[model samples]
Target chain A: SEAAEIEAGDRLDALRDQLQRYETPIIQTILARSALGGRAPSEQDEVRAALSRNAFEPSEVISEWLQTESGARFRSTRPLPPAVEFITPVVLSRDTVLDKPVVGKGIFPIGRRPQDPTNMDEFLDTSLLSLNQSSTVDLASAVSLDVSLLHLVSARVLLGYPIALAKFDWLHDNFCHILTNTTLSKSQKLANIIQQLTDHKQEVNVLSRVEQKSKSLSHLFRNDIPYPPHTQDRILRLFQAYLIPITTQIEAAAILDHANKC
Target chain B: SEAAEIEAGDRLDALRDQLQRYETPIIQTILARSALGGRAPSEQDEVRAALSRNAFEPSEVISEWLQTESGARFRSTRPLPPAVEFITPVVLSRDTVLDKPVVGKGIFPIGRRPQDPTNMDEFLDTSLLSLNQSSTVDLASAVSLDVSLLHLVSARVLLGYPIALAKFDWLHDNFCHILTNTTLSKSQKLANIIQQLTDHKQEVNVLSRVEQKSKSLSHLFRNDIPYPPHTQDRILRLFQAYLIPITTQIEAAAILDHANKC
Candidate 1:
């Protein structure tokens, strides 16, 4: 029904909005730590030099897992379609951005590039970290690299990221049954996990109370927006692609560290 | 099977260990703040005077919810049992402590008391908040008061308390179903929430894998140690009493604020 659709729309909007809100702050923190201790200098070259020199020292294990230039480039160029087909509510996909060689090539360039890339690669390089999504990458490595990238960006704000990542793996290892053995869609997987954790009937209901008085609000947007259905499903997929991997990895590590000390 | 028992044991140990680690730092911060700024000078009278003069201003709504001495004491004295039954692991139960007039009465009395209470109330007054926990209190009020208390203490280490509280409620409201229902125990509740939020499972495994190659250590404690089984459960209960309430309240308020804006 349109009720479910509207609810999904609201959730997708919330998640996207929250994520986008973090974009500037996250980038700024990365810049802040990269050089000048978050200080802004008058000269652009100085800033570039600062960032270029701030290469993080990943653990030896992570360093070994680092893909060669060719390997990274190949994965970045893989022809996997974007997770979400439409883009109004904002979707981030490796393949969609990678389709542009200029952008795709920028995903894993370690050294400094004085001038920004004219297109996507430069944007990606200048903005996000230099890691390509790859099948060869194990979940833990992917999450750790992602966590390290974030740790380098803003350590305090994202402290829970590693801890939360560890917690996710703990749940995954113990409750593998509920997660699999069913032909669930991506969103369904998230919903299932959310449902079991909170003991609520549906994840959406937990987030938003259905307003009997606000039925018209749902009807008002139904035909007016003319957006396609399955938007919620797509957002969930985008979430899986962009958010879950890193958070779970970091949480697992954090909790693991806590456990061993005990 | 013992597999599940072992897993639960592992999870409980990790949680207790983390909580206990924070206990000293948290108490030290409170004491440091209570006397100077929450500062202290020599003499019991001087400390009381310092605290008496340390009234915090609240927002309008929160101010309205603030209780007078009588009101706060009444709520604090309600016949609530400590959440956990056992005591060795140091579980803090509201009911258990409240039932003890010596311990319960001390929960809200502002200012320092020289001697430890023969019971929990005295401990509460001397150690925890100078304010009492109250039913008349709204979530925002509770959170603000708690925040104010923490702020007066160590600002840097505990800076994320409120922010994390908000994030927790955000996750909670958005994913309530994942928390309730099913026969999942309390520790499992934490695991479930951690899992769905990050898409991981098994909170126990995340914290203790480092011990696998050293099974002798597990055996070492198995025979030598003679702690009660309920000790961990009680600690978890105490955590629920002492830690969860304020964070959940703040989180609820934060999400409520966001929901209103939306």
Candidate 2:
């Protein structure tokens, strides 16, 4: 009995050390960054108020940008044939592949040739056309406009501002997934794959949350992003708010009639 | 009850007759195109005696002619970006997503460009480098090559051959999938989604079958396709033979560094 107890103690010690190694980083990096230990909300209240004024239904604003704004109208000029389809590893909901479709939105902003500023008008028009063409957006994009907001940000890497952060977040998640997947041994590979899956779930959760927050019915009800509820306006607003910001510098600099950089 | 049964039978017969409207065309087309029904080779010797000494492995010869042998290298001279990935529909096979990864062969010949032909030698060298990178000839790419080849003959639209074809194939598949999905009602449309999953499967199946047949080691082993046992030349020859013939003239021209345009 003594001998068995001694062996058990050794095993317990090893387990504790193993736990410590992984736990230490989480504690330091995540826990330490938490606001629980520090005073908060002093600046957030003021910042929210200031930002909220311009933010006024960011989704609606984005929609308006797409509909009437010149920049929102610009993306339609470029040919986004490549942007038509995308694939990624996602833990799809368990449904009959026959029964339920995995849905995502694709933006087809008419492309403005780098030189053809004149084409921007039509390009803006094209996103509207594509929005209609894209079967994903029913009434006008029933696959969930919130999901579309997230997808447009994810797929159109060049649109600037909020989309930059969203895209960067996606890239960061991608890097983490890649880092987690390079193990040589089967056991280690399994562990890494599990970790990647967990990370992916977390990322998707955050993206969905962000999309929900940005494109909530309250905002859409207000109709600020696009100002008008028409399909083209909504798409254009989101495009300007998210995609155009990041891509414009490159496309604008390239001086083509339309920038297909993304 | 007897009268009702007779009336139902009469309706069924009418419907059956109407359905038969499609039968005549199907029969005539099948008869006209049937290889078995067509004239037999006048003489076995005339039909089968080695018709001509092949200049290159058939697949490789076709691939080269498709991508090379065209004067594009000298004319357009712009090398294409190597195709690294392909966007495919998300369908489950036994609770797992099929690894329908579009590899380098599935993509363009150059690693990172769509339209830069100036470096003909550079394009040739880069393509060879990619050729060296893969160990197996991809069957998906063979189907892609076939579709690409068919495009050349089908339409004079003359978009960037490989890229445009890639876009078309990708869209057609996705659009068809959107159509076929019955879950979302017809009024609640997604795209040009036709609800005929079986039809799409049949088309993909035919191409996939052709691809598998062309790549089978049996053909090479039996000398039906003219390949040696183990050398790299045999490997390359196998890849080339299966991959080439199906490519469109444009894709064939692109792959051959525009050298075979003549």
Candidate 3:
């Protein structure tokens, strides 16, 4: 009797706990939809259904578990902490994606940038392409390239035209969202981009001073070969090859949204 | 005007000009692979080809360019300035690889870290999912996660982690080199990582204790839920969701060396 007869405040807390145990799934459902940014429709359905069924949704517990797994619990940007995993994937094999010995380009070990020029093999699943192939999907189809736009932009720098690059430079951030929200077809997105690109046709072909690469080293070496000779086309090629896949993916997602709407 | 006067230079003078033209691309190549923690084979070919095409392949010019491009010219941690046309394919499409809020997780609007969260959107290609179909892929891809890793590591204090987040964590140093070298195989390169993570996991995970909602809001919102549990998932998931691609990329580069052998 004494154990049960603590203060009314304690009884209130017990009742609140019972109520929360019942209501927690709703909060988790909302959090999962929002915080866990990307989930396939099937996965989303599973998660939603799970949320509805569970008497005690452990959103906080899972969140904590994730933090531990990511080693974000640590301040450094190292790999996932081993403790987070019950089983470790042992390395059965490995290889280099490149052909030469790449020396770090900067004075600092971490340098102005943090990536090493040739040391990236330590963290990738080179088997991804094969895995995706088994899935009958290229990486672009299975995954996405939006995170890689910077690489494309970095590649475009070879063209030596900042002013020309400016308008479309914002394409990644500017139009990606619109594309997400819009109900436009992939053809429409392509057409819109084509129009914009045509409008800037002059900038596309012309060289900018920065893109020239003829300044210090070229003038000093007196090399005859013009850098980025087919500047517009090459830049355009990368866009066509790289950007199209990404944009197509975006359009595809939009299409999925439209299908859901219908 | 005399053509000879325009062409005048030392024995390696013509080589100097050729080499000068090579500077931008060579540095660009270095920048691209540096962020990846290694160089692409194509990049090695480009840089070396650029170096070979010129007669005056002065070691000094090449080294200096390498140093400057990978050092001083870097826009953010381990990354170079965005090429002008980068965003077109990567950001504008509907796949939307990044989080919807436009947080600064990539290498645009370049800097070590944005001073305020407000300007985060400018650097972020948030709708990268539009470009890449799977948003998780964007967050987990090699290049995208590289920027996120740098961002997270650079956060120092604001990220409520367990370890003493040093402003100059060694993870920062190694991350750069981890991707730039080509000699190590993926398994060989990443072999030590298991040991590394095992050593630091607990120390880091405990940091989540600091994020208790009561503690987080005690100073800001006295009226709100005082003892909200630490958002451990928020902490852990950020890395897996946002930073893992970088680790995967580096590990992939290191291990990919064995692919051909297999």
Candidate 4:
């Protein structure tokens, strides 16, 4: 009777014995319980940190949003994380599906972000794509442009435009969520966005304004190249026609909603 | 006076002349309008095509859910597509950020899927990893294991467990959404899932029962390798503890919700 009583304890050894007794229940219960209580929040922290880690103040805008009721509500659906795997079957394998890595685009490494995000002034410290702008033909930007468009099209057909639109729409709504949920005024949101944009300019695409070397969301909306069907998207319109205008009050919040960060 | 009025027309020639006149507005209006009107729907069609392309009958189940009010509501948010870019900053260049590609999970291309997904019966037509199981030290599975763990941890710490959990939770919910939205009886959902599973086994990871060659989402739930900060996740528990029980009525539905497909 004493031995049986000890066996019932929830301690690690007892739990182990329970599981080893069944090799099923205890581990399953503890694993499931620990997952529900402990694992989820820690992962949420990582997500929060990644966004807030940016020097950009608006970066904090997003981190702050992640904690909001609306932000929390949006993420609860699991749309964002599974999406990586969902799109991977297309994004990672895009080149494989093509006849060849389309001319100009190549898959390769990205360099470190500028140590000080404001270091955009440093000629020695520049993004790989930023340096790429000077080239006669920059395949790096090419990767983002012609290659990027092709990949989206492939994804459209392979993954479907609704899948694509759904993903983007979620972002627009979240971006709207972030700007609206925050304490910042419209002027402050606009001001914060400029700093964020400036910081963003220091990394990734750098300055396409100087030349067409940087990647942009606008690439998907171009006329010369025929993008696969993704039209009549209410979310895209929400950004353009509705929420975006609201943000001007900071529709300029498009800084987060439509751009790379959003 | 007539010539001056002709120059003011809003037609394409006028629009182009105006853009040539102003270099912005008319094109912006046309591009934005066309994007909202023409492009988004075409892409939705492509998405519908990709998912419906599957021969599996339950394939129709998901497609049908996609059209439902709840399903349409979920897709409207844009969380899924933006998430692809959101995670890419980590997933795509994971190797670049690493000391080297982790022990055995080399980056490589996947072969085409079996023309008929149930072709696991053939050896000549086998997945790379399926054949990999026979190797004494299988690095292909190595990628999903050692490499995969490292990637998730990196994503956990780097992308954050919240981000990770948020994404997975969305998936759990959507799977719940799909099953709930379906017209099928519990018996039908269970039966349809087995066929989808059989079809699944044919393409990606093949016979892990004979050997541990295939990738399972369960790899994330392992013990030896200390997965970071994803503890106490309610969604994982919902899968294990809650929705799962109701599903034994097809909790066997874990076949989709917990495995590679879900």
Judging by TM-score against the true structure, name the best candidate. 1
TM-score of 4: 0.16
Candidate 1 per-residue lDDT, tens place, A133-207, comes to 222111211121222223222221122332333334444443345445367764465445433343223322311
- Ranked candidates, highest DockQ first: 3, 4, 1, 2
lDDT of 2 by residue, B179-211 (tens): 455677543432122221113343343334323
Docking outcome class, model 2: incorrect
Please give the CA lDDT of all the candidate structures.
0.28, 0.26, 0.26, 0.24
- What's the lDDT for candidate 4? 0.24
Candidate 4's clash total is 48
- Estimated TM-score per prediction? 0.20, 0.15, 0.18, 0.16
Predicted complex 3: DockQ: 0.03
Number of the top-ranking candidate, with lDDT as the measure:
1
Tens digits of per-residue lDDT, candidate 3, A72-156, equal 2211122221111121122122332221234652111111112211111121111121111221111111121222232233222
Query: What is candidate 3's lDDT per residue for B1-262, written digit by digit as tens?
Result: 2333233323124332322222222122212222222222233233223213211111342224324422122123222221111111121233433222355533111112222112222222222211223211111123333332222222211111112111113243333354346777655545543233232242222223222311221221111122123223223323323222222222223222222321
| Two-way lDDT contest, 1 vs 2, winner | 1
DockQ of each: 0.01, 0.01, 0.03, 0.02
Worst 10-residue lDDT window, candidate 2 chain B: B47-56
